[PDB]
Amino acid sequence: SDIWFEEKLQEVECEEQRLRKLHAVVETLVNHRKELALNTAQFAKSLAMLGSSEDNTALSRALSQLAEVEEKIEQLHQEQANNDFFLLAELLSDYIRLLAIVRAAFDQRMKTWQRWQDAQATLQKKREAEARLLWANKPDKLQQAKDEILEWESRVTQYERDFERISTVVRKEVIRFEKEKSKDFKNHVIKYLETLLYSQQQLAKYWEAFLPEAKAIS
Amino acid sequence: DDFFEQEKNFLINYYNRIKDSCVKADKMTRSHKNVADDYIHTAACLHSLALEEPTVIKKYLLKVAELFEKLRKVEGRVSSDEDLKLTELLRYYMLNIEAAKDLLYRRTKALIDYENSNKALHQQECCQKFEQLSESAKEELINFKRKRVAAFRKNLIEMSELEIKHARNNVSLLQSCIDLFKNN
């Protein structure tokens, strides 16, 4: 017996659990960021209305300008959320999609193994059918049993060889999933991290431009 | 004196504009802390996911989970400062408007008192009392306007500085992380 498969299947099923956990948390983060961009849009509108209701020209000017800043920020929030979901949240779903591919491989290995075991059970009935005919007085039917045994002798040989190859594919698939991870994971992470760096850079410039407008309030 | 007339309409209208922008600012800040919560919740799943995994990447996950643990700190900070500078400012002057409103209400009351004595004449004190209030009222209302312009400019400047502070902080935080991975 080989424990590697029974063990590796556990590591795979466990990693998929940690992926769905982090994925579900990200989905709430995307929605919460979308929810924030909406509230920011509402606030930006209320600010412009406040600036109009104002009777102080300077305050109306500053307030109106502040609303414009918030108007730009709410867009960054939405694009950030969109970048969260697509870059970060679709990054997770893909791996969960690949993990399920290796799970199906383990499941397919058990299938081939089951059919291989089912063939073994079919062969015994053949040998037993001949044992009963050995005492009978019909050489024709006897050769009929000896032939079906020969045929099924090769059948189980085929299913056994299939199980060996299928067991090798799962091994080849797991290694492929691991090598592909370390090769592209780092870049995919940097891609998203840059999406957050761009947002922060935009936020700063937004406020650095409004700061002089705030000081200019007389 | 039409000053107290236009002032009445302005205060009534501005209060609704102030109250509206107050609840909107609160909702926005509260939504900020929500995103901040997901930051620590995400860094946890990242840290817990990096445990069982090849060592090559395993260290990479611990660097992003550590990054989110810090980013959650800045998001919770910007939400707090946002509540203090904006929501609190709108709060303060939502009640300050109610106070100025009460002043106008009292002044008009003393006005009708003088208006009554103005239709009879020996107690013209309602006239002296009406002017003692009309003068102090206009003196305080103008004092309010001047204090409101300084408060808005003061908070608007401070908020801009804080926003720039956290923005640069997150930029450096992210920057170091990206530059770290780019140069493994």
Residue numbers in the entry:
A (entry chain A): 305 to 522
B (entry chain C): 206 to 326, 342 to 404
What do the paper's sentences say?
To understand the molecular basis for heterodimerization between ESCPE-1 protomers and its membrane tubulation activity, we determined the crystal structure of SNX1BAR–SNX5BAR (where BAR stands for the BAR domains of both proteins) at 2.5 Å resolution. The structure forms an antiparallel dimer of three-helix bundles with a curvature that would fit a circle with a diameter of ~32 nm. From this analysis, we found that two clusters formed by F347 and W511 in SNX1, and F273 and F401 in SNX5, have the highest binding energy. Yet, only F347 and W511 in SNX1 are conserved, indicating that these residues likely form a binding hot spot. SNX1BAR and SNX5BAR exhibit complementary polarity at their distal and proximal interfaces. Consistent with previous predictions, the central region of SNX5BAR has a negative patch, whereas the equivalent region in SNX1BAR is neutral. The crystal structure of the SNX1BAR–SNX5BAR complex presented here, together with analytical modeling, revealed that SNX1 comprises a hydrophobic binding hot spot compatible with homodimerization and heterodimerization, whereas SNX5 uses distinct patches of polar residues to preclude homodimerization and enhance heterodimerization.
A key component of the recycling machinery is the endosomal sorting complex for promoting exit 1 (ESCPE-1), which rescues transmembrane proteins from the endolysosomal pathway for transport to the trans-Golgi network and the plasma membrane. The SNX protein family is defined by the presence of a phox-homology (PX) domain that typically binds phosphatidylinositol phospholipids (PtdInsPs), but may also participate in protein–protein interactions.
